[PDB]
Structure formats: structure tokens, C-alpha cells
Design a protein around this ligand. Sequence first.
Ligand SMILES: [Cl-]
Ligand SMILES: [Cl-]
Ligand SMILES: [Cl-]
Ligand SMILES: [Cl-]
Lengths: 523, 499, 493, 126
Amino acid sequence: PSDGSTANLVPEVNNEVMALEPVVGAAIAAPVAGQQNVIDPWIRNNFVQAPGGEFTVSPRNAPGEILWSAPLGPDLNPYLSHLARMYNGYAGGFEVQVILAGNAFTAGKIIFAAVPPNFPTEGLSPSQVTMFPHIIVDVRQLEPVLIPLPDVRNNFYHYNQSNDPTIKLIAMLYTPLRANNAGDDVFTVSCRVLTRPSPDFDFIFLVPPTVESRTKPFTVPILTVEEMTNSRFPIPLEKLFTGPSGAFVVQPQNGRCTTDGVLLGTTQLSPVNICTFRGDVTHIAGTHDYTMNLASQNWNNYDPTEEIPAPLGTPDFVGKIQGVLTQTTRGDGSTRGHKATVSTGSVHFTPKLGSVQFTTDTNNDLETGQNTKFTPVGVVQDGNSAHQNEPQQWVLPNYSGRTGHNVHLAPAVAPTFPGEQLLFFRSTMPGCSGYPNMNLDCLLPQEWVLHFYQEAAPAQSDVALLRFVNPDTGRVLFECKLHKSGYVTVAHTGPHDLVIPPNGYFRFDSWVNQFYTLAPMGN
Amino acid sequence: MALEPVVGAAIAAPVAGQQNVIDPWIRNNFVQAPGGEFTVSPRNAPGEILWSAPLGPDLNPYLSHLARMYNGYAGGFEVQVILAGNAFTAGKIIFAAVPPNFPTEGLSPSQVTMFPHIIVDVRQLEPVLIPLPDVRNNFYHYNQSNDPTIKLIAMLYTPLRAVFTVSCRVLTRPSPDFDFIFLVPPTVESRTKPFTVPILTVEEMTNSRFPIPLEKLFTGPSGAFVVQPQNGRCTTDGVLLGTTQLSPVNICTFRGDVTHIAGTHDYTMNLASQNWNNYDPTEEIPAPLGTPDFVGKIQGVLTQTTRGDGSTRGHKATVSTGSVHFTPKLGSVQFTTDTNNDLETGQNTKFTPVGVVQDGNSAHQNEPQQWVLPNYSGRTGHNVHLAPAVAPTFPGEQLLFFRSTMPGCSGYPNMNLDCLLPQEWVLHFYQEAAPAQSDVALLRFVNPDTGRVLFECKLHKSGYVTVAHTGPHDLVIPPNGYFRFDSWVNQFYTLAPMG
Amino acid sequence: NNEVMALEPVVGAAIAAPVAGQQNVIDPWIRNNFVQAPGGEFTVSPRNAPGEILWSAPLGPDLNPYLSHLARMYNGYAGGFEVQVILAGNAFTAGKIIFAAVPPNFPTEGLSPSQVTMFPHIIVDVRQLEPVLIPLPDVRNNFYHYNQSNDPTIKLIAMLYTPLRANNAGDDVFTVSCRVLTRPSPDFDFIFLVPPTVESRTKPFTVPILTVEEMTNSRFPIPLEKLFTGPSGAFVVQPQNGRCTTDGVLLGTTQLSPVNICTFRGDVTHIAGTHDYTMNLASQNWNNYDPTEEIPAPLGTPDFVGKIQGVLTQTTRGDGSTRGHKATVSTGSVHFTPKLGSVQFTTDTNNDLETGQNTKFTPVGVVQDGNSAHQNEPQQWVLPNYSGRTGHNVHLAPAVAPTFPGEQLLFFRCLLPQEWVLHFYQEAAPAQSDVALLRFVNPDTGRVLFECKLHKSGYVTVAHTGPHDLVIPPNGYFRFDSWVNQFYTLAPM
Amino acid sequence: PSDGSTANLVPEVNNEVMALEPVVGAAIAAPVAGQQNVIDPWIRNNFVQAPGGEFTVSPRNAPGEILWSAPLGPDLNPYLSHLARMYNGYAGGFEVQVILAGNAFTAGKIIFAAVPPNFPTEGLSP
Ligand SMILES: [Cl-]
Ligand SMILES: [Cl-]
Ligand SMILES: [Cl-]
Ligand SMILES: [Cl-]
């Protein structure tokens, strides 16, 4: 029966069964629900992969790590997820199916456990997880694991828009993954979670779709690298780059945005205003330098009291940016435009306090009362020092100059998982004079910032798994982890410029956590 | 009474592949259609089809969202019509069900009575109920196909007697025999995403004709000019037009190799594509994408980098559009710079635009003519593959422009720049590619503090907006106001006057 | 996931009986024996990643060569198939494949693995020994299908769900080879008997058995030499001769005669005192030339820039005068305007061409100017301006470039032999996908040397990088193997 | 039963069967043959390796290659091959046994097929 296929090398099914009583679904809610609704019976009879339906057991994982977790709710099932945007509430349980059919040369155990509502999941130890209803499964198990997930609760049903907690299903590495295949230890166990609603699950109140915040689904734009723009300087993107970041500190303040659309640092939505300055200008006697008193991005007054490190779009590196100051007189429409340069490392670069200093090519021809705009163009380098040393993209300017220290900064960013490096969207700045370091890396393209901002999709976990696909060949080039904090990571060691098909796009495949093990990509 | 019952998806069971069920509550509530907004005004006459819709899931917003999950459907609707008349408003409207392959073009009001129909007086208070059965000659309909279905038609049956515009609404709900057929994943390639307009504010968006932020909305008469820009041209279903491309930074840039012209401070640039790829002049495009679409002199900076040592140079530079040496379709443009010796030929060079200039000795505010297209192939031929020109079509209506003010670098220039669509709207339509269910998408501008509707405008499928006003006007807008897509309408829709 | 596909039963031709003309029978042996689809091959390799569609096919007679041959004598069909898929693995492997049924008119392109799970589906372990049986029902919204209408059908899709994890053995990488077999379900049947091989959409596609030597170039009236592959980044490959689509639509300036490829016919006029002559052109059938016709130029206009020397010939009506003169045409001269009707020749006599008499230019060779750069005069990939500076070149055949990584164009040294153009033109077989797989066979030994992709458009591509003259046996021929979905990755040289 | 040997690591037997009808042998020929002859019954009850009875599946082989082929006749059996040098004709069929007991770490499939007389074998695709 199983000769030449599985060969009795592998557990067939699990004895163990979770110690949960049966729990009623939406039937109790009928006298107090507005309506009695119906789900397409095919959805109830057929397992489909959950939005967060991928996880991995690899040798990089350590015992105690939660490899997969989810609270009970419509987001456990992609059909129910779209249906949920059309309903106000729900009640009832799920049947979850887990596939763990690892190669016969591997070893290890996973614990699945149901933790009840309002118990904190955060510090849980393997010992502690054993005290909930639980199942211990071998990483080699052949037949899918079936876990019923009842809607334990103390009310008639749940509202989509509230924060009342539900049961959480937890999968934790109970034993480290080991293997004895005698080759190279590539035998990572790729796992899939599929679900379907129990018969007692049901939606409750029909409401206008797409308007309830907590049901908007997450997506990632189909745009290509060439079609997007750098989020730290008004320039197009050119290539994808990964490299080690142990030496320096990656803490940009432009192109910083969370997956659910919260802007951070000095980040704003306009791709053109990313290194612009607007305000009134003042001559410095005897020199070609001017002092600019800052206006807001929309020509209103700037308030330093805002919980921001600087005005939105303030440059986030130390260097000399060359551009053009332009000015217009309201009465006659006279216009003047002169080459100008701002050094963000100068002690007179204090944009948090309201003033920035330019060095121009005139000591006249700039009025004191007219509005003036600095349009950035490129970066320059002092030719007498070491080549490629002046524009230090990972050095933050002192936004308050000599006074005080930088405040309310967006956090720094580093890989957290063994074997992983940041993935940078790299643009090449124009040089205007000298031998400058023209490399510019941002964490998120500006169009991704726009997309996350408008569609405020609740993050289902801390990491969105993306795969980069060549639409010509249908092939995946690499996979990467987009963290909710707004940065991307890949599995690679060393610097590398990526070889990308011109048509390549990012595709969102699954919600995962920080312990997901990425396929080795480079070379 | 004039139509028999018509079976829905039940007949399809032996060939369907699956048996599905729709939430029965969806058929217990009349709800306004994604279209479902039309207007009767005294400008309208009998014979104009004032409103029409085909049977399908797009008749009902609940079914419309569901349809993203199904491959097909079958069955009928019950539709409810509501007319906001008053006792001084005389006239009759006919609604009629016209069967799938009957031509509607040319119908008289008399002829419309020969279909299943209802004749309702414009001053009626109570809603009228129309049955819409899914008459067909196949087992069911596919969502991805445009096989025809019964059409509901609304026209004026007798002339209207009344500036009084009658607001009308169409609501629907599925018949009990309606059902979807094959459960399928909601993918992006399905083209089942419904059409929307970004939540972004005018203030926070960007002009599609020059790399500047937007500033205000402007309406004006356009009889003097020919409105035919080639940037910021995109269809609501995401088809780019003219020289329009997606990157908001490349909207007036040039990249290529540079050559000195002896004895002057002028240089010739041999152009490459935006991707630093070889340039092909055989493409069906008026010019390379991002080429300026107005006649004027644009001041910026030429930038150059030497492969090997990292040498970088930057010099004030100026492009004169419409000059005889402006031939970007042929592959070359001419700059006037502030140097005659310091630009190497082998190296790649980029023009970063900043602003426009005007010769101060000529008439003030005359140099940048935004509504005059340059000659993309210079003297050696005429412009080709153009995006069509744009003009108001409905009496009393003018174009609505998204206005930003260009930086001036010298002189007394016309710093006014109007685009038909914000660049972010081009981006949004491109990615979403929502199929247009009619020729006009009605937009309303909303104050989010109160929810109040400030004005309505027509976003035409061709990718341009019109509004009801006469004379020039800068719009007085709350800084946080946003555009909202409200309904599909047709060319006969009468906009509420604004101002 | 119980190994059963979540599809309802779907009736075949039984529903059609009240509306079909007649009742027919299929030989029961065809019904009882699984047969491999021509494109029914795919491979699971460790490079494969989740989401990659390894194989796809639409329901139809083209899956089964018996039904395909039978269909050429019937008017329609209805009903489904039983599919048998065989997986070549062992107990030391891990990984999952999903097979999914996608309903008619739904796009297969861009699906994520999560989304594919949302169809009726089956998840099969790479260790499965017994063949997997998938029923492919004829989901449709009509009573039955007509052969000539090419209705859309269900598609079977095979996608990698879990990567293959297995040791290798030495430097040989372990792969799981898969085969797709089919046979008609009991409810499948053909419908109306009709004269065989008449209905166009049932003709099978073929490729001439001719050898490279035995064929002829399509861009100049000269034989072929060898098969050449090379990178094409430096230049634009956009010929206008030898451009013909697989189902027999001619493109650009391509015509059928293998000798009229670079010829001119018309009446000739002297330019006083010079060695120049002006020819007002006709057609190749000796009719007036119409500039309104949506063609680049008269058919057979050369598709490169150069100076071609040949011989003009003229015959005077009435006396039998016979004149033949060495002559030269420059397609790069400013007076080459064939779209408007004129070309200029440079001869070695200034008084030997009468007025009003028919004159024909015969092509023999091209010429090189020894004072300019060597190997510079015959520019193969540069088109002339047929309009000759008036307006612009219009209605050109599209340019041609490989789009799949690792592939370069395969040239006949032209994109298609002239005999291939003739074959496609006559036997106008519909293409079942965008790519026809061709195999190159040595008839003596019977073994296959390489395979190439013949695109629906008139061009061929091969798997190799860098320029190369091919290692061709003298009697080798191309043999058509199958239509393949555009993701098919071919083995290198 | 197989604990310690083969160990369910390998397929045991094929349930597939060739779709051929039964065919009479030399019995039909008795009224027109010269004689009714006899073969030593041991030859009929015991498998012996054919003259061409070795073939290999190796990684150097490519799919589509015919690894083994033979037409029906006395040459399929070494005893019958010696006996056939004494007789003028023959009629009837054979039972052939193929041994494929490959190592458990290998993979791949072979097709066995019966092609009828007067069909060309030379160009056959899988
Ligand atoms: Cl809605
Ligand atoms: Cl989805
Ligand atoms: Cl959406
Ligand atoms: Cl209109």
C-alpha cells in the first residue's frame, strides 16, 4: 500500500487530541443578532490556505520560538477575509489543517496549543505552553494535522471593529530541527496552514463593504523598480542592493513608514519635496551666503513644537546638496534663479530651530521679503579630501545644530535573524562637483510609502513574506521579508548588486513572523 | 405582468461545476447601484436616453464585491426608482426593459412603450418597482465576458416643464433566482476591482506636467486655447496616453551623451530612453516619455559623471522648447549652457529641470505657452501619435484643472501650469485598471470634518475632468478635502453649479 | 485534502442530444487507454520555488492525438477527460505539488500559491507512487462546443506548493520528472460527422522536412548556408522579408516567390546626360501600384540598407529587341522612394533604355566601397526609408528580440526560410499557444540534437549565449513536437 | 515479512496490464502445417535469459531512447534459438519477464509497449 512511496519511514497521523470541550458558534446569537446569514457551503467544505499560511522549520530556528500564530477570526481564511469586509461581526469556530511532511532524514517536534482569551502570549516558555490544551507533532508527520479551534468567549458574538480578544492558536518549536541525510543540511521543512470555517461559524450583520478599518487587506504595488522613485531624494530608483550593515548605523528619516500606514521620522507623501526648502531669505554681510527662515511644506508657518525631528522632507544625511534658489516678487512677477548649496554638516544647518544657510553665486539679487524655494539637483564633494568620503548617507545631521540633540527619531534598522541582511532600494545621485559618494539607499520606495499610507491595512503579523517574480518566465528570483516597521530583509551574506529582470515585481504570498527562514538567494 | 418568470442559476447545475449560495439578506434590501444616479433637467429632451444599465452583478454594490470571488452568475433583479420632483414639475419618464440583442440607438418614446415598461410622473413621491429578469439564451453569464444582457433604459416620455434639476436614484436587489456560480480567488489580473479615486488631498499631490507639487484647483473657459497636453494623460482603466509615464521625477528630464557646438556655449545631447537604454524612434509615441508638452524655455542643470574616476560636473543649462533644434522624436535636443569646454562627450549626462524663464524685453508673461505643443520632430515633419485634445462638451460646463505654479528663474514668465490629472491619479488608474462601466465617472469633493459634499464634477473616461461653472475661478477648498467616486453616469448628466 | 478534487459532476454530450443533429460513437479502446498529451511533460527541480506554474493545459481534443485526429472529421464535441499524472520520485524525497482546475475565462497569469489553493484542487506529495487521477469536467455555459469557435475551457494547472528537498548524487542534481496522461471520460463524445479535413481550425501544425541546404533565404534570392545564433543587443532585428506567422498570415514586405525577393518591374526614364535612370514601379503581377494599401512598400522591397548591383533587362514590343545591362540600386540614396513609386538605377550606358517599355531588375549581388570602412557597406539590420524623407515609414513588421533569460535568436544565414513561409502560408494551421516546440533530429542515428522554440510570430529562439555557428549534421531536419505554454524553459545546446 | 529486506522502500509489483486481446498460436495452423511438433515441456515452464537480455538505465541515457527491443520469434529464447535451426517455421506467442530491481535511492520510469506488425519503430516519440 505504501511501498516505494513513504516506505513506513515517517509518522502517518497523530494520536494526540486537544483537551478542549465543544463550543457553540453563532447559534446562540440568533435572538440578539440583527440577521441570520449564510456562507457559501463550498467555503465550509474545502480547506484553503490561510493568508498567514506559510512557516518554516530550519536549523537556524531555536526551541521556544513561536513559528506561527493567529487569533480566531475571519482573517484565518482568504474567502472569509473578503466576505468579512461586508459584515459587522461574526461568531463560531474554525478547523485548521497543518501540513508538515518533512523529509524522512529530519527530526524535531512542534507543539500546537490553544491559549484562551486575555491570557498574555508574549513571554511564553515551552514548559508553559504545555499547560494549555495542546498537541505535540513530529516534524516528519505525513498526514495533515487537524486542529479544531472553538470560539471560546463570554459574549454572544464578536464585533469586527472592537478589540475583544479571541483564542489564539500557537505553533512553537518544541525540539530543534535535526537531520542526518549525510549531505548538506538543506532539508528545511516547508509548512502550510489551511483552514475552513466550522459549521457553527457565521457572519452576523450586513454592512457597507470596504469602510471598516480592521478588515482592509494588505497589498503591495505591482510597480517595477525602474517605475518607482527614491524616498530620500527626488530621484528614480535604479537597482536593488543588499549588504552588511554592522559597521554603520542605518537610521534614515525619509522613506520611513509602517505597513499599516503610519508615517515616521521626517517622511511625507510628496516625492518632489524630499529635499526642498521654502521660506524667506537673508543676506550675510560680505559673503555669498544666505540664511533662510523656514516655512512649512505648503507655505504656512512652521511649528517646532510638533513631535517630529524636523520639517517633513528635511535631508537625512550629511553632505553638500547643490541646487537652485528661485524667487518671485508678488508685485511685478520678477523672477530670479541662482546656483546655491546647503551643507547639512555645517553648524548653521539647524532646521529644527527654523533656519538653514545656503552658499550662493551672488551677494545681491535676492530680496528679503519674497518666498524662495531650493530645488535640489545633486551632491558635491570637497576635492581635497579622500575620494567618496563627504556625503555620508548613514550619518544623521544634527537637526538642532549645536543646541540640544536629535529627538523623536524613527528607530534604527538591522537584521535580526541569522543569515539575513537588509535589502536596499538603491538610487544614484547626480554629482555636480568633486568625487562624491553617489550611492543612495532607502528602505522603502516612495510609491510604497504612498500605498501604505492610503490603504491603512492592519498588519496580521510583524512580517509580510514577498516573492520577486519575473512575469516573463513565471519564476521567483528571490524571497524577502517586509517587516511591519517598514524595512525589507533578504537571506544573503556579503555585498551584492541584484541582477533583476526589467519587468520584475513584488508579490505578497503570506503573513509570517520574524522566525521565518528565507531561501538563500544570492549568486 | 408583461414578462414571465425566468430561471436563474438553477438551470446551470449540470454544466456549472459548483453549487453556490448567496446570503439571502442581500435580496431583502434595496440598495443604490454603483451607477444609479441620473438627472432630468429642462435642457433634456425626449429621445435622449437619460440613464441605462445592463443586468449583472454591477447593479448592486453588495453583489459587486461578491463578484470578485465568483466566475459567473445568472438570474434577475428587482429595481426601485426614486424621483426627487416637486408639484411644479410636469412630465413623464419611461423605464423599459429592452432584451439582450435589440439595438437601442434611435428609439422614440412611442417605441419604448412597446417593451415591458412603467411610466412614472416626475412629481411622484413613492418609489416605483421594476422587475428585471435575466432573459438569455445560454445557461449563465461569465464575469470576464461582455455577452449582452437585458438593459434597463430611462428616457423622457413627455417634455419636462419646470433651472430646476430633478435628482433621480436607482436602487436594486437580486431576485430570489439570482446566484453566483464558480468560487474563484480575487486576483489583481481579474480586473474585478471596483473603480476608486485616491484619498489624497490636492495639497499633498503632485503635478503630472512638471515635477512640482499641486497647489490649487482652477476652472476657466478654454475657447482661446487648444487643451492638448501630452503628460498626465491616462484612461480611468489605466491606459497611458501621449508622452505620459509613471515616474513623477522624470517629467521634464533628459539623459544622454553630449557634444559641443563650436564657438558657442551650446551643446547637443544625443538622447537615450529613461532607463538608460538605447533610444528607438520607431515606437508609436509622439516623443520619449516625459518630454515637455509645452513651448517655453526651461532652465535647469546639466550633470555629468565620468566612468572610471568619479569626476562630476554641474552647469546651469537651458532648453528652449519649440526652437528648431528641439527634435526629441528624432533623438536630439539642444541646450545653452554657461561653459564651452567643460563637458566630456563620452560620459552620460542628465538634465534636471528646476523652472522656466522669460525674455524680459518682450511682452510680460508671454514666454511659456502651456497649451501650445512643441514640434516633436522639428521642421522635418509633423507631430504624430498625439493624445487627443480636450474641451468641455456639456452646456454650462468648463474643464477643471489641477494648478501648480512653476519656479521662475529669470524674467517675467507665465508660471501657471495646469494638468488634467494629478500624477498620483495616473499612478492609481494604472495599477488598479478598473474597467469603466460608462463614459463618465461622477466625483464629489467632500469635507471630511462634517462629511458635507462641496461640489460635483465629471471625470471622463478619456482622463479629464469637467465642472459646472462659467468664467475663471480659483476654487475655495478646505485643505483636507478629498475626491470621492460616487456613481457612473452618462453624457446627459447635469452637474450642480458650484461657486 | 483527501486526494479528491472538489468539483461537481458535469454532464457531457448527453445534454446536447435534444439539440444535436445526431448520435455518434467513439472506438472504446480510446476510452479505456490513457495517452500522453504532446506537451504533457514537466520537471520538479530544487531551483523551483512556490508559485511557479510547472505545467498547464486547456481541456480539448488536442490533449489526445486520437481524439485530435477524430475531431478533424466531426463538427463539435462535449464532455470531459480523466487525467493521469505520474510522478518519478522515491521515499527519500519531500515536497508537494498542487493540481488545480481553473474555470473557463479566468486568467491563469500572476496567481500566488495561496490563491491557487482557492480553486478546486489536489495536493500531491512528491513521494506518491500510484498515479494521480484527476477528473477534468467540461464546465461550460452552452450545450456543446463547435470546433470552429474555439470556446474557452477549464485549465489544469500544476504549481510547486512545497520545494523539493532531497539529496543529490555526485554532481548530478536530483529531479522529479512528471508525465501527464489523458483519456476521454464516458460523457465525452463528438457530435456531427462532416467531410474530413475541411474545417480549418482542426488542421495540425507541421514544419517542412527539408534540410538547411535544401532551403532558401527569405530576404534575398539566394540559398541558405548555416544556422547561426547570436546576441542582438547592439542592433535592431526588424527584417521585412521572411516575416510570416505560424498560421499563415504574411507580414511586412514578405511574398511567396523565392526568386522575386529583390526584383523591380516597371517603365524606365533617362536623366539627361548622366548614368542614371528613373523607374516608375508596378506590382509583381504587372498591375498599378496603390500607395493607399497598408503595406510598407511593394512586396519584395529589400529589407536592409545597401547598394545592390544586378542586371536590368528590356524587351521592345514588335521587333524582339533584347537588351541586358549591369545596373546598380542604392536603397540608401535620397531618391529611393518605393512607397511613392520611384527608384533610381546607375547603368553603364546612357542611351540604351527606351521609353514606355517594360524593364525588370534581376538581383545578383551587393557592392562595397573600398575607400570607406571595411565590412561596413552591407548593413543587414538597417532599414531604408521607403517614403524617402516624406512623412515617415509606416506599417512595418514588428521587431524581434528574445524575452526569456538565456535565449538568443536563431538565424537562418533571416528569421524563417522561404520554404517555411510557403508551408505556413498554405497549411494555415492554428497555433494552440504562443510557442511551438521544435526538435532537431539526425535521421541516420535517430537521436535528437537540440530543441528550439518557434514563436507564433515569425521567429525562432534557442538556449545559448554568445555568437556561434551551429554544429549541424548535413542531413538534419526540424520536427514539430508540441505546443507549449510560454513558461517552457528549454535545454541548452 | 519484509522487515530488514527491501523494507517497503521500493514498489513491489505493477498492477498495470497491457490492453491486448488473446491470440491463438500454432493450433490454428494444424490443417495447413506439414506436421504437429512438440517442444520439451521444461522449456515451456521455465524462464531463461534471452539472447538479448541485458540492458541498462544510467544517467547517460536520455528519455525517449529505446533501451531494449525485440520482435517476436524463436530468437527471444536460447533454447528455441537452437531448436529453430531445425524447423522451417513457427507460430505463437511468448511470455517475457523483465527484472528491474533497482536500488532504493534511484528514480525513473520505463514504458513497455507492443507495436503491431508493419508499423515503423524508427521515429517513435514517448
Ligand atoms: Cl462600498
Ligand atoms: Cl486573494
Ligand atoms: Cl481592495
Ligand atoms: Cl459629457
